[PDB]
């Protein structure tokens, strides 16, 4: 309701033929209960390419649920997310 | 086209905890769309952080605003910085 | 000398209440700093979070074994905030405690 909970899900794309470009295109071509906000993010650098999603939830349980719209990205990239983090929103 | 920067502190080396920073917070800029404080607890360790939403990559690379006070509260600069392009948002 | 520890817990997953919201209410409505109930040495509110699931609870230190098994005192407001009675009760003997 007022306290929000954040889940961050990240894929390192070093071990995948998918890139930020290819995944941006699949997003271009191709309302969940409890979910206030869903954001797709990316990063490029010497470290390598990364794809991810940031979820704002209105309940603590949902934050640990299987993240929505991840199954489709899993088969596109080739594997389970390399990183997953859990936060509380303290002030926005 | 928006950009997202996140600044984090591992709190294990500070007297500060998520709880004490939360309490302090409770009792107390060009290009910047949104500023959000975040925290993390559990077996992996305590963290405090700020998430910024920018509309330019320059401002995003600029030194994070409103971080000065927190650096004083924790006792050191952020231990981790990450930089993202926003691809899509609801 | 012999003390008895009763722990009552609420699983919060079925409730609109959360650790954050219970903690916020507590912050704006301070509980008694001292014990009122005869035989009650100490009362502590506790919480847990993370993948296991959210929980709220009360830990009681009693000087008699009868009270340890009675209805736990001072939980009426929390029961109203959560919307149900404790989902779990545990009974312990204190075998040794540091001072």
Author numbering:
A (entry chain C): 6 to 35, 42 to 103
B (entry chain B): 8 to 35, 43 to 104
C (entry chain A): 7 to 105
Give the article text.
Three monomers occupy one asymmetric unit, two of them form a dimer. Each monomer is identical to the others with an RMSD value of 0.21 Å for the backbone Cα atoms in the secondary structural regions, consisting of four anti-parallel β-sheets (β1, β2, β3, and β4), three α-helices (α1, α2 and α3) and six loops (L1, L2, L3, L4, L5 and L6), which are arranged in the order of β1- L1- α1- L2- β2- L3- β3- L4- α2- L5- α3- L6- β4. The first six or fewer residues at the N-terminus are invisible in all monomers, and the residues from 35 to 42 are also invisible in the two monomers that form a dimer conformation. The β-barrel is formed through several hydrogen bonds between the residues of the β4 strand in one monomer and the β2’ strand in another monomer, including hydrogen bonds between the E101 carboxyl and S53’ –OH group or R29’ imide group, between the S99 backbone carboxyl and the S53’ backbone nitrogen, and between the S99 backbone nitrogen and the S53’ carboxyl; and a hydrogen bond between the Y97 backbone oxygen and the S54’ side-chain –OH group. The β-barrel is also stabilized by salt bridge within the β-barrel between the side chains of the R96 and E94’ residues.
Thiopeptides are a class of sulfur-rich, highly modified peptide antibiotics that are active against various drug-resistant bacterial pathogens. Dehydration of this residue at the early stage in the nosiheptide biosynthetic pathway generates enamide, and subsequent dealkylation requires the activity of NosA, which has recently been characterized as a new terminal amide synthase, leading to a Cα-N bond cleavage for nosiheptide maturation with release of the co-product pyruvate.
